[PDB]
Amino acid sequence: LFDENYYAKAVANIIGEVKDPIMYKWFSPDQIEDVDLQMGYQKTVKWDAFLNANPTTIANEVNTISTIGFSSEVVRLNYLKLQYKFRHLKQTSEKFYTSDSYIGDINNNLLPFAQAYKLASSEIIKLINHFVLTGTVSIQKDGKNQKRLLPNMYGLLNMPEQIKEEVASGDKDKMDKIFEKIEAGLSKLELGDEFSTPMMVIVDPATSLKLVKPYAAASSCEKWEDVLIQTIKAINNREDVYIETSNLLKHKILIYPLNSELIKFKPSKYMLPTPNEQVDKDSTDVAHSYIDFVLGGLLATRKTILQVNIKQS
Amino acid sequence: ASLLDSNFVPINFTEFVQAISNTYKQRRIQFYENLKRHKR
Amino acid sequence: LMKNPQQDSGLLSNSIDFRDQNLIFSNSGGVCTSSKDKIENYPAKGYPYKRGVKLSFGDGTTELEVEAGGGDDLYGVCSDIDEFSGMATVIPITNNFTGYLTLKKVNPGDKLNFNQHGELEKVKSVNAIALSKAHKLTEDLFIVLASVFGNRAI
Amino acid sequence: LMKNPQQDSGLLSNSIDFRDQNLIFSNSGGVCTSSKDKIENYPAKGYPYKRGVKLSFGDGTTELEVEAGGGDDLYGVCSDIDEFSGMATVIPITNNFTGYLTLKKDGQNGVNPGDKLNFNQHGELEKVKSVNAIALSKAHKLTEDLFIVLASVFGNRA
Amino acid sequence: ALMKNPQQDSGLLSNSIDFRDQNLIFSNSGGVCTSSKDKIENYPAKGYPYKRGVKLSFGDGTTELEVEAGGGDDLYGVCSDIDEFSGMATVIPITNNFTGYLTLKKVNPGDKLNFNQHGELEKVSVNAIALSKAHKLTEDLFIVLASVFGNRA
């Protein structure tokens, strides 16, 4: 195949130069399990039990007894396949565009196929990281004109039925108020049996800079970050608490455990960019290529993620 | 059946895509093996 | 509209708690059920789930069915539906029932009566007493724990 | 109201005859299709299947969609829908189209081959001003309220 | 001043970290969504009709016809790209629908736009529908995402 098709050989020889996605730092190795499905859905079934009324006293003769009810829940994860097209130069025409230190028409913004594919793959990986973190797909910095997505497609920041706290605008710079809101959310967190697990906090750079200040008369050898780590260690049975900073978030704090039982990422085995076999060719020197990627696959238990939003005026 | 294998020779584009997927999986496994998070 | 919600849930359920986990529409049957209860099954005409039912007669070509209703035509209270066969489980008004029923869109100890739509409402001819307050499952769906024991006298 | 009937069937189909076996609502696309046709896909609001489509703009948070419509807002003709993704296939009004489209349930008996047709507010074809559509057959009734007709759309008119 | 690629060099390297709002530049040639079955024609360029509606201009007869910025009843197509060395403008005919950023006269999604005498879109014959609000790149340069669907009254 490599001899017959130049593009496949170039993709194989340049695939190693693409950096790994940053989403991997947000999850444990066991939390991620790939699935073989491009487009479609997957289903799972859970069973719950509940008490209908107070217990019945067994005294003398009785026929009416309190009942214990049961319920079934079907959880569906949807997957979507998306494609991008990019222009490039035909392989046979590169000799007419090679220069002293570059290859490609600068005046017309034309690139060799390998470099164009690398740049497009990097941009697509950035988009996928943004989707995994925020639960939305958009190219505007404001966040409008979002692509309409299928239901049961959520991210860590937009997951429903989770603990949500809001720090007031007047207390935007008050780390004591921010920590009070974080403590309230931590108390409202419900880990249950899966408590002896590592915890993960993702913060914006401004929140990290506020955290690295000493805890407050100010204390010595005790920072707000250390106080937060101790607080989370109180509720995770003194397990490791990891703290990361992401530029994608803005005035947001995301706290969640790293246990596969509570939160699991089951992405498609084709989620990362993959070249398509269709290459548009014409009599000119400009060709077109296609890249495919699959989105969706995040599953989380309810009331297990804390999302703190610091309102900015 | 991965692109990391020099001896690998894709017969067809489907095998090439499968090799790409296997290479991505091996890359993420290696990243998790080499990762060392900073405690405290 | 459906005993089991048609749309699949997006998230797993948290089952570490044990309090207030029974205020759901899929809680079929009764909170207190006796082994000597008389239970019938009828063809369903509509969605009479958790509603007072009345006998409905067609043109005679097919058998009779049960539909949501009350007033002077009440025949019993539906507590379950098998969707595949369209079968409505009915407990006759001659047998007392205690469970969650649909409420018209109320304090404990209040007298309740079934309306034309088979929904409980505050008060005549039916002995129904609410044992709790209205629980709002949806913007238009309200339930209430009540005990229905026969009919009253006018 | 769906590309494929929602209710299942109790009978096997008889694959013996070969005539008049295409007058079904599941027949997507066009009877005559060119390999150089421009085909787009859009988010679908409602069910614009086999109907003229127009651009619908929301508040701004989400992207634009296509909805059943016509008149001065006609953007194209929907020929297929993927229900799982909610995707409507659109052929632009600048591209020639020949196929079966929904017809208004009023005066359908008067629709004869060679009659001029125009899209209404609901994306339904009706006998005639601004769109060049000519009926190539008579109304075929698939349901008490569903009528289809073979028509060719070849752009806007002066 | 108005060329697709600025002649003035950049003082500093760009920061290639963000991926949002990095396409609303004047150098973005072509369309946001393009099909492989689109018809495009190169024509001699009279003036600078890049990202503007073009009309056919005929000379005395010694030289071939060319395209110049314009609109109205004389509109022939939309210029989507230009090669300065050959002075060649790539035009998508009005018979073909186009979606991309075009020059707007110095406007909300859903507005109806028609080309003026200078090949600039303006609010209202309707030739395009605005898909976004006007984006300012220079004191006089305003672009807008529009969907051209031919001519219709």
Q: Look-up: residue for tokens 């109304």?
A: D139
For residue A186, give both structure tokens: 């931590």
For residue A301, give both structure tokens: 């238990």
Contact C31 A154 (CB under 8 A): no
In sequence order, the 6+-apart residues with CB closer than 8 A to the CB of E7 are none
Q: Could you tell me if A258 and A243 are in contact, meaning their C-beta atoms sit under 8 angstroms apart? A: no
Q: Do chains B and E touch (3 or more CB pairs under 8 A)?
A: no
Residues of A in contact with E5 (CB under 8 A): 106-107, 109
Q: Could you tell me if D155 and D94 are in contact, meaning their C-beta atoms sit under 8 angstroms apart? A: yes
> How many other C-beta atoms lie within 10 A of the C-beta of residue A19?
8
Q: Look-up: residue for tokens 């489980």?
A: C89
As a whole number of angstroms, the distance between CA A154 and CA A160 comes to: 8
For chain C, give the DSSP string. Answer: --SS-SSPBSSBPP-S--SS---STT--S-SEEETT---EEEEBSS--TTSEEEEE--SSSS--EEEE--GGGEEEEEEEEETTTTEEEEEETTS-EEEEEEB----TT-EEEE-TTS-EEE---EEEEE-S--EESSSS-EEEEEEEEEE---
Which of A121, A211, A258, A270 to probe the B interface (max B CBs under 10 A)? A270
As a whole number of angstroms, the distance between CA A297 and CA A299 comes to: 6
Tell me the residue type at C126: V
> How many other C-beta atoms lie within 10 A of the C-beta of residue A255?
24
For residue B15, give both structure tokens: 């095998």
As a whole number of angstroms, the distance between CA A308 and CA C48 comes to: 44
As a whole number of angstroms, the distance between CA A298 and CA A264 comes to: 6
As a whole number of angstroms, the distance between CA A51 and CA C17 comes to: 11
For residue E118, give both structure tokens: 């200078």
- By C-alpha distance, the chain A residue nearest B11 is A1
- Given CB atoms, is E8 within the 8 Å cutoff of chain A? no
Of residues A15, A29, A277, nearest to B23 (C-beta): A15
| Length, in residues, of chain E | 153
Q: Could you tell me if E91 and E41 are in contact, meaning their C-beta atoms sit under 8 angstroms apart? A: yes
For residue A205, give both structure tokens: 């750079």
For residue C32, give both structure tokens: 């207190």
Q: Could you tell me if D111 and D127 are in contact, meaning their C-beta atoms sit under 8 angstroms apart? A: yes
Q: Could you tell me if C82 and C28 are in contact, meaning their C-beta atoms sit under 8 angstroms apart? A: no
Which of A75, A68, A71 lies closest to A54, judged by CA? A68
For residue D120, report the phi and psi dihedrals to the nearest 5 degrees.
Answer: -100, -170
Residues of A in contact with D65 (CB under 8 A): 148
| A135 Ramachandran zone, left/alpha/beta (phi>0; psi -120 to 50) | left
Strands of D52-56's sheet in order across: D40-43, D87-92, D74-82, D52-56, D65-68
Q: Look-up: residue for tokens 């740049």?
A: A119
In chain A, what is the straight-line distance between the N-terminal and C-terminal CA atoms, in Å? 59
Query: A12: part of which helix (H) or strand (E)?
Result: helix A6-14
Q: Could you tell me if E142 and E106 are in contact, meaning their C-beta atoms sit under 8 angstroms apart? A: yes
Q: Is the dihedral of CA E41, E45, E50, E54 positive or negative?
A: negative
As a whole number of angstroms, the distance between CA D149 and CA D99 comes to: 8
| D107 Ramachandran zone, left/alpha/beta (phi>0; psi -120 to 50) | left
As a whole number of angstroms, the distance between CA A138 and CA A149 comes to: 11
For residue A271, give both structure tokens: 């989620």
**Nearest-CA distance from E33 to chain A in Å?**
9
Q: Would you give the DSSP letter of residue A268? A: B
For D78-98, give the DSSP string. Answer: EEEEETTTTEEEEEETTS-EE
For residue A302, report the phi and psi dihedrals to the nearest 5 degrees.
Answer: -75, 150
Neighbours of chain A (3+ CB pairs under 8 A): B, C, D, E
Which of D7, D4, D76 lies closest to D44, judged by CA? D76
Which of A24, A27, A236, A289 to probe the B interface (max B CBs under 10 A)? A24
As a whole number of angstroms, the distance between CA A209 and CA A251 comes to: 12
For residue D94, give both structure tokens: 């600048």
- Given CB atoms, is D72 within the 8 Å cutoff of chain E? yes
Identify how many contiguous H helices and E strands chain E contains and give both numbers. 0, 11
**Nearest-CA distance from B8 to chain A in Å?**
11
Query: A23: part of which helix (H) or strand (E)?
Result: none
In terms of DSSP bridges, do strands E88-93 and E75-83 run parallel, antiparallel, or are they unpaired?
antiparallel
Q: Could you tell me if D48 and D68 are in contact, meaning their C-beta atoms sit under 8 angstroms apart? A: yes
Of residues A25, A29, A272, nearest to B24 (C-beta): A272
Helices A224-235 and A175-188 pack at an angle, to 10 degrees, of 10
**CA neighbours within 13 Å on the CB side: how many for C123?**
14
For residue A21, report the phi and psi dihedrals to the nearest 5 degrees.
Answer: -65, 150
Query: E119: part of which helix (H) or strand (E)?
Result: none
Contact A274 B21 (CB under 8 A): yes
As a whole number of angstroms, the distance between CA D72 and CA E152 comes to: 8
For residue D72, give both structure tokens: 């001065």
As a whole number of angstroms, the distance between CA A300 and CA A162 comes to: 10
Neighbours of chain E (3+ CB pairs under 8 A): A, D
